[PDB]
From a paper:
The arsN1 gene encodes an N-acetyltransferase that confers resistance to arsinothricin with high selectivity over the related antibiotic phosphinothricin. Here we show that ArsN1 acetylates both AST and PPT but with higher affinity for AST, indicating that ArsN1 is an AST-selective N-acetyltransferase.
In one conformation (PPT-1), the orientation of L-PPT is similar to that of L-AST, although the sets of amino acid residues used by PpArsN1 to interact with each chemical moiety in L-PPT are slightly different from those that interact with the corresponding chemical moiety in L-AST. In contrast, the orientation of PPT-2 is inclined at 120° towards the AcCoA binding site with respect to those of PPT-1 and L-AST. This brings the α-amino group of L-PPT closer to the sulfur atom of AcCoA, which is more favorable for catalysis. The side chain of Asp85 is not long enough to catalyze deprotonation of the α-amino group of L-PPT in the PPT-2 conformation.
Numbering used by the authors:
A (entry chain D), B (entry chain A): 4 to 179
The structure:
């Protein structure tokens, strides 16, 4: 009942089940083509080489996942990280989401990142409240920055601060 | 006498001369490695395959350049584009920058983009005023997102709305 494990490439099929509808029918993800199970399988592997990738299991099945990712490419951005959480289309009011974050965030802090950023396609008052009750501060919005499903969607950014200012290179999740 | 030209890889050298010290000792660019002339020569070629790359020439020399680049990776971001302008560290109080934007922006609009974004490392009253008097809206700031030269830097984003809501795929600057 909502236990959080480190993900694995074998969990690709159940992560795709969650992600496929989001891509086809929502503007939650700004992708337009559904990645295959094998494609999701390479993503998980690639991510785990440097970043945490978590899954939330319930009754022995994956009902949610969360992974971190590079914020930007330039060197001076290395203490910044993107965070991404998708719960399965129904077991929300989450819950699963807050928990996935309750594990992902402290692990991020340990590795040395100073800030975490979440992209939230607007409107999504449910997703917004979640982040804001975790401590995320809204720091900006890119209006009409994207076009999907015959509509112009804004993208807002929420920052989670870890603090600090001594500056040493962010270590990676033990290179899986 | 302040003339705006479409860049070509032969301008690589003079582009670096402007850009190399900016990387070494400013927070304007978050690159840490100083790019060579060959590296810059490949960036110009690659950019010109899809995006406009401009230079400002006066007295037969480059005094400012400007280029467009992909804003984000995912498909629904395809009508959004990043903009970058660097002028010569002695020919500023520009001038040059305004003339670059006077050319770059309308090209972008005719290419089918709906919004252009400029990322400004803060503080910079010089660059901020420029964008504000051109029509850019401040849409947010990423606080302490970068660390370089023993200091944490905020990055601001300014948006230039081209308008429209009919949505046809952005065309490239007549590919090389
Ligand atoms: C709108 P987008 O595709 O940029 C980000 C999607 C999701 N919120 C995430 O955190 O990955
Ligand atoms: C403020 P800046 O000039 O470093 C922008 C960096 C670039 N967006 C990135 O991909 O890191």
């Amino acid at each position: 009942g909502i236990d959080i494990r480190v993900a694995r490439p074998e969990d690709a099929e159940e992560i795709q089940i969650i992600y496929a509808p989001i891509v086809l029918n929502t503007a939650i993800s700004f992708e337009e083509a559904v990645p295959s199970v094998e494609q999701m399988r390479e993503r998980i592997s690639t991510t785990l080489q440097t970043y945490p990738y978590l899954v939330a299991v319930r009754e022995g099945r994956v009902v949610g996942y969360a992974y971190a990712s590079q914020h930007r490419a330039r060197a001076a951005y290395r203490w910044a990280v993107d965070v991404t959480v998708y719960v399965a289309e129904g077991q929300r009011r989450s819950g699963i989401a807050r928990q996935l974050y309750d594990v992902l965030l402290p692990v991020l802090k340990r590795l040395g990142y100073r800030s975490a950023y979440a992209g939230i396609a607007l409107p999504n008052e449910g997703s917004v409240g979640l982040h804001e009750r975790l401590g995320f501060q809204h720091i900006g919005t890119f209006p009409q920055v994207g076009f999907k499903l015959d509509a112009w969607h804004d993208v807002g950014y929420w920052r989670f601060d870890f603090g600090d200012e001594g500056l040493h290179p962010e270590a990676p999740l033990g290179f899986l």
